[PDB]
Amino acid sequence: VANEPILAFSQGSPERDALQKALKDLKGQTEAIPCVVGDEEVWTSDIQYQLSPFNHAHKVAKFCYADKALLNRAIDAALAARKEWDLKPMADRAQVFLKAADMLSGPRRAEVLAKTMVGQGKTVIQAEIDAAAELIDFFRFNAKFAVELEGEQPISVPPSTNHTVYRGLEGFVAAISPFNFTAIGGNLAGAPALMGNVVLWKPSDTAMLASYAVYRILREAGLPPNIIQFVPADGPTFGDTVTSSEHLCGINFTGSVPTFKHLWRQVAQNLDRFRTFPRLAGECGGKNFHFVHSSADVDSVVSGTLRSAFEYGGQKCSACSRLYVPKSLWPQIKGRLLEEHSRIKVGDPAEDFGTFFSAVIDAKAFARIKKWLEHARSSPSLSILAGGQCNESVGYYVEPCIIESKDPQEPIMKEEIFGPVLTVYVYPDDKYRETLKLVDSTTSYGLTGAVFAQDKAIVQEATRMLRNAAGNFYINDKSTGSVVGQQPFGGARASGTNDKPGGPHYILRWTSPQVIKETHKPLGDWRYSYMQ
Amino acid sequence: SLKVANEPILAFSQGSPERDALQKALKDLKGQTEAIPCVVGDEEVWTSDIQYQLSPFNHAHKVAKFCYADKALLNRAIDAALAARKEWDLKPMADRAQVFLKAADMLSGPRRAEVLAKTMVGQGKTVIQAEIDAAAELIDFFRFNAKFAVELEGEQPISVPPSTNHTVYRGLEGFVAAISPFNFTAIGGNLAGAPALMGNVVLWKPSDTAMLASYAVYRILREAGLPPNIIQFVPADGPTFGDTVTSSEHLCGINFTGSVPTFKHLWRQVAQNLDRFRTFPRLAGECGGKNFHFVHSSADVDSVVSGTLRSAFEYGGQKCSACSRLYVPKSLWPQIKGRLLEEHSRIKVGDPAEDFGTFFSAVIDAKAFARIKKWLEHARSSPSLSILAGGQCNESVGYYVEPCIIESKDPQEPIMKEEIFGPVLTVYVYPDDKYRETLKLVDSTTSYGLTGAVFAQDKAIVQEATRMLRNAAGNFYINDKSTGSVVGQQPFGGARASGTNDKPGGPHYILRWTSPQVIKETHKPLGDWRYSYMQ
Ligand SMILES: O=C(O)[C@@H]1C[C@@H](O)CN1
Ligand SMILES: O=C(O)[C@@H]1C[C@@H](O)CN1
Known part of the structure; x- marks a missing residue:
């Protein structure tokens, strides 16, 4: 077959x-x-x-x-x-x-x-x-x-x-x-x-x-x-x-x-x-990562992360919800994420085929996601960079949300939200290996993860270090969409x-x-x- | 490769x-x-x-x-x-x-x-x-x-x-x-x-x-x-x-x-x-298991006897795969019973390091000896049980138990259900024309599903028994003994x-x-x- x-x-x-x-x-x-x-x-x-x-x-x-x-x-x-x-x-x-x-x-x-x-x-x-x-x-x-x-x-x-x-x-x-x-x-x-x-x-x-x-x-x-x-x-x-x-x-x-x-x-x-x-x-389920090395192709990082984090509203066991970015690439990745974010259409998928994703599944999911957005408005380590709006008057509509965390082990970096909520942690380029260990040690989950890098030695090292952090592991591709x-x-x-x-x-x-x-x-x- | x-x-x-x-x-x-x-x-x-x-x-x-x-x-x-x-x-x-x-x-x-x-x-x-x-x-x-x-x-x-x-x-x-x-x-x-x-x-x-x-x-x-x-x-x-x-x-x-x-x-x-x-x-x-040898009237009697003796008594029956219940049709029971008792009398129990003529030796320890002895005593007290051969034991030098053959008149006797892990074979004789009903009893009597054997030369009986016993044994044997997987x-x-x-x-x-x-x-x-x- x-x-x-x-x-x-x-x-x-x-x-x-x-x-x-x-x-x-x-x-x-x-x-x-x-x-x-x-x-x-x-x-x-x-x-x-x-x-x-x-x-x-x-x-x-x-x-x-x-x-x-x-x-x-x-x-x-x-x-x-x-x-x-x-x-x-x-x-x-x-x-x-x-x-x-x-x-x-x-x-x-x-x-x-x-x-x-x-x-x-x-x-x-x-x-x-x-x-x-x-x-x-x-x-x-x-x-x-x-x-x-x-x-x-x-x-x-x-x-x-x-x-x-x-x-x-x-x-x-x-x-x-x-x-x-x-x-x-x-x-x-x-x-x-x-x-x-x-x-x-x-x-x-x-x-x-x-x-x-x-x-x-x-x-x-x-x-x-x-x-x-x-x-x-x-x-x-x-x-x-x-x-x-x-x-x-x-x-x-x-x-x-x-x-x-x-x-x-x-x-x-x-x-x-x-x-x-x-x-x-x-x-x-999982709390899945996209880990970016400074050698990554920025355009692939951006489109792969937008798809993994937000397609079907983030309601995938495999969806990326934590993105790790080196400081040297953050101006590029932040700028591109925020510009592309403004182009994402949320709406009725039966009436508008231009819709990127639609409402989340039900009132319980909506309420859970709103609690995480309210947490992101409260925590001293968190900042909403884009999105954060929600409206359940017609459907259970949550806009895609991009958050930066200064704390790599904040609860939002650990707990599965199952909504269109991406948290980014920016690490110093010279703390690359320490951050790889954080990817592995921060959550209780081990489902999917991706590494973006064009350096062979880096890919080999990350593959060994993340061996048990993901059962479906992706090199230069997004963490969703297994076939x-x-x-x-x-x-x-x-x-x-x-x-x-x-x-x-x-x-x-x-x-x-x-x-x-x-x-x-x-x-x-x-x-x-x-x-x- | x-x-x-x-x-x-x-x-x-x-x-x-x-x-x-x-x-x-x-x-x-x-x-x-x-x-x-x-x-x-x-x-x-x-x-x-x-x-x-x-x-x-x-x-x-x-x-x-x-x-x-x-x-x-x-x-x-x-x-x-x-x-x-x-x-x-x-x-x-x-x-x-x-x-x-x-x-x-x-x-x-x-x-x-x-x-x-x-x-x-x-x-x-x-x-x-x-x-x-x-x-x-x-x-x-x-x-x-x-x-x-x-x-x-x-x-x-x-x-x-x-x-x-x-x-x-x-x-x-x-x-x-x-x-x-x-x-x-x-x-x-x-x-x-x-x-x-x-x-x-x-x-x-x-x-x-x-x-x-x-x-x-x-x-x-x-x-x-x-x-x-x-x-x-x-x-x-x-x-x-x-x-x-x-x-x-x-x-x-x-x-x-x-x-x-x-x-x-x-x-x-x-x-x-x-x-x-x-x-x-x-x-x-x-x-573990409570494993069976099922005999149909078309079986080769000589293979039934030697296969059952090996499965029941090798290593003193201390195998998860050992046969402990034998189902025999009334028509073959005279031939099988006489041959079992004759061969039983030739089984040597003793020291396996000193006498390579030993068929099997003592059971593993005092706790197993005590458990088996209680079952032998049950076989002497139960109105539905009768000891046909063996039945003695002696732990003064080693944990020695004779091979014991018991006939049960009750297919649901506790000795037909519980794993003994000793050299104790129980036989249930069934009327030939009730072989289908008896196959259902083979399947339903115990809680286990490990090994089992059917002895029959009739192809249709083998096929029928194979279907009915599908979940009674994970290792199923046709005209061979229930032990000794390779x-x-x-x-x-x-x-x-x-x-x-x-x-x-x-x-x-x-x-x-x-x-x-x-x-x-x-x-x-x-x-x-x-x-x-x-x-
Ligand atoms: O990888 C994914 O996103 C999907 C979800 C599971 O059905 C497995 N394949
Ligand atoms: O079939 C038997 O008697 C042995 C016991 C297990 O080790 C599997 N083989």
């Missing part, structure tokens, strides 16, 4: 016309999205709404929370379907995801793009690299990796033949996905299902519209009933219920560190009830278990291999010849 | 060089006690907590005197290992692999008799059980894991202009605690060695009852060039060791083989302390209560001990931050 092409959406292109039509189709619409258990559409009385981030008077979806009883019924029905699904040949399960990929690539591309734009506030290009390219690639590449894994077989020596069976996990997997990438939900539920597991998928409230579109495509591509249950739910209720089931065998999580730790501790408390040891996979099969994604420290979705080993977390030895001759006597 | 093959099993025939070498090594150990220190870096350290390892078949023979590391020494070993980790992790994978390939060659040749003899005298193994363990399996772990690790570096991502992508297989940041069991010398070498191969530093707590052979393996690794502070040799009280390593903010992994309750205890300790760790520790555990051929492990099933002996095990980093280097300027569609 090859990577899905990123379309250019030029004027008069087929994809731009198709997208504009899909956006027009959605403009005044609310979809009633039920829970799906097997083939049954289930409504509870716990009604919820997904709002359009840039126009929160527009309810894009009405959905409901599954209660404990519905979740337990979804577990029971999934468990009853698991054996038949696990016994299917790997190629037959892969075919579902390959057909779903082809649907997303072609006739459903505009739909999933438009639903990600209106429901999660993404611009055209951010929806294209997410709901199309990345999700399509997850499905195609994981299918390839899984079919290839069946060929990894042990040595056979006469008179015995050995065969490895890549079993699904026995039980069900709980998939808990975040708002910020439509593709991640598809992968968190889809990769375990591909490997023969059955899944309860709790999608993110703030991404329900696009998440359900993906779910329906999987069902239409041939996913049998009760292999993935579509079960929006209150977060704590969902976690309590699945960690209370004796049949839990895995959690595939992406979200906050505290939630992942909570789930981990619930599993540990309940170890005595489970039939097997559940497998927890988590990607938990399936090219940059498998994840990191350690507090950023998670680093199972590297997008690479060939991720699917191994969702299989429990069995080795069958068949002997084709009689065994003979139990004694040994040396005993005589 | 690396070309390796399994280590050949030697025959130990009369007059052979390996038989003469082993007899000399055994003679050299017979009257000896080795004083085994803790090793931190290159320093031999003694504490006041003196302990002894006894010869299981002659417990008046203290084969080793060692000591338990105290909490101060354990924390000093952590600090020193962490201070050595970055240099070791930055070594090329091929350079780390060379240590284990050299160690494997030493074990294969000049050190073979030493590690065999120490496993025999210290753990009670016969010649062949020591040979398949301390020689063949340990050598194979070192050679095959080295091959798998060198080849893993060639698993690289796609690059598209203008960028080049590379995966760096980093060791875990922190230290790994390796906690090994008494019953296989090879397992301790793998539990400590495989993480070290992948760039980790390790605190190795070996089993008290396997100390002599475990230290022999440790010395061989150091002689093969393992640098100081990469593996710390730290025998310790079990609870004290777990408390110390799970209290360190730098714990990144636990590689464990032993009991279910101990593994669960460590897992809960890590969860309790989650807020202090720099990263999320990785727990790997293999935790590295590279039957990667070993199972799920349910048997552990995390990381399959040591196969190509994926080492992936638990690496945390990959992907580096993207872009070779052209980035251009503008706007996109063309925005114009």
Whole structure:
């Protein structure tokens, strides 16, 4: 398989016309999205709404929370379907995801793009690299990796033949996905299902519209009933219920560190009830850096940092939020950042394709980001250089904000904001090595980071010093935008278990291999010849 | 790339060089006690907590005197290992692999008799059980894991202009605690060695009852060039060791083989302390089984008998893979029962160093002897149980237990569910026409999922049983015994209560001990931050 092409959406292109039509189709619409258990559409009385981030008077979806009883019924029905699904040949399960990929690539591309734009506030290009390219690639590449894994077989020596069976996990997997990438939900539920597991998928409230579109495509591509249950739910209720089931065998999580730790501790408390040891996979965010050496190409520093810090409002686990600049380059980089900042358009991405990024996801995110801006107006070490405005009267709109910190270990240099907030620390050129150590030691995270430098010896030194500061490390490129099969994604420290979705080993977390030895001759006597 | 093959099993025939070498090594150990220190870096350290390892078949023979590391020494070993980790992790994978390939060659040749003899005298193994363990399996772990690790570096991502992508297989940041069991010398070498191969530093707590052979393996690794502070040799009280390593903010992994309750205890300790760790520790555990031999009416009776006798009673049944429940159809039970009882009477139990005619010897220690004796007494009191053969034991000289064959009328008797780790086989006879119902009982009776075998010559029965028993065994055998997996051929492990099933002996095990980093280097300027569609 090859990577899905990123379309250019030029004027008069087929994809731009198709997208504009899909956006027009959605403009005044609310979809009633039920829970799906097997083939049954289930409504509870716990009604919820997904709002359009840039126009929160527009309810894009009405959905409901599954209660404990519905979740337990979804577990029971999934468990009853698991054996038949696990016994299917790997190629037959892969075919579902390959057909779903082809649907997303072609006739459903505009739909999933438009639903990600209106429901999660993404611009055209951010929806294209997410709901199309990345999700399509997850499905195609994981299918390839899984079919290839069946060929990894042990040595056979006469008179015995050995065969490895890549079993699904026995039980069900709980998939808990975040708002910020439509593709991640598809992968968190889809990769375990591909490997023969059955899944309860709790999608993110703030991404329900696009998440359900993906779910329906999987069902239409041939996913049998009760292999993935579509079960929006209150977060704590969902976690309590699945960690209370004796049949839990895995959690595939992406979200906050505290939630992942909570789930981990619930599993540990309940170890005595489970039939097997559940497998927890988590990607938990980062406080990612762009580190600049005095030899860097300034124009690449500027555009790469503007994109990494502000695309999709900074709402990426991989977004740059700390920029380290040598004093000798600061007049250039400050001047260019501030001039380009004034050209950034924030607005409605469905109506204005000139928009660079739009509103942040919801009222909770808006309130959290505003608190950080108020902190930046209070702290003696912080100064807002540009931006700092926010307005939630129409959408949850936060202007891009550039802050300078005189303190390299200020809280704003350490804590994940998940908003369009970039903090810059200016270091003396002669304190370069000491500052590299600060990049490594300042935060608890280890997800992404970039070094900009045109000096080979400097790049080699920085690469060694930052070896554990980033699981996705970039030389002269921005810290966001990993591509399936090219940059498998994840990191350690507090950023998670680093199972590297997008690479060939991720699917191994969702299989429990069995080795069958068949002997084709009689065994003979139990004694040994040396005993005589 | 690396070309390796399994280590050949030697025959130990009369007059052979390996038989003469082993007899000399055994003679050299017979009257000896080795004083085994803790090793931190290159320093031999003694504490006041003196302990002894006894010869299981002659417990008046203290084969080793060692000591338990105290909490101060354990924390000093952590600090020193962490201070050595970055240099070791930055070594090329091929350079780390060379240590284990050299160690494997030493074990294969000049050190073979030493590690065999120490496993025999210290753990009670016969010649062949020591040979398949301390020689063949340990050598194979070192050679095959080295091959798998060198080849893993060639698993690289796609690059598209203008960028080049590379995966760096980093060791875990922190230290790994390796906690090994008494019953296989090879397992301790793998539990400590495989993480070290992948760039980790390790605190190795070996089993008290396997100390002599475990230290022999440790010395061989150091002689093969393992640098100081990469593996710390730290025998310790079990609870004290777990408390110390799970209290360190730098714990990144636990590689464990032993009991279910101990593994669960460590897992809960890590969860309790989650807020202090720099990263999320990785727990790997293999935790035993209650393994089955299932016989269909089409089975070859001779293979059933010899395969079950070996699986049930070799090394006294002290294997995580040993068969302890045998399911026999009523039609074959007369033939099988008579042959089992006849062959049972020919099984020699005795001193494995003095009598190479010994089939198996004493069990490992007084605690195992006491546990097995209580089960034998249960077999004499239960109305559903009857002892068909064996049943006696005697601990006056060694911890000697006869092989015992019990028939249960109840497929759910506690002796059909609980791991004894002794030479105790329980047989359940089922009506031929209930073989499907009985297969469901094989699958549902115990909490374990490690090994199992089906004996049948009917192809359809084999296929049917293979489907129904899919999750009853992670190592499944057709017309062969449930013990004796070979590295590279039957990667070993199972799920349910048997552990995390990381399959040591196969190509994926080492992936638990690496945390990959992907580096993207872009070779052209980035251009503008706007996109063309925005114009
Ligand atoms: O690198 C990035 O920004 C995206 C987010 C994750 O889905 C991984 N790829
Ligand atoms: O299958 C067996 O009996 C041994 C025990 C483990 O070391 C794996 N190989």
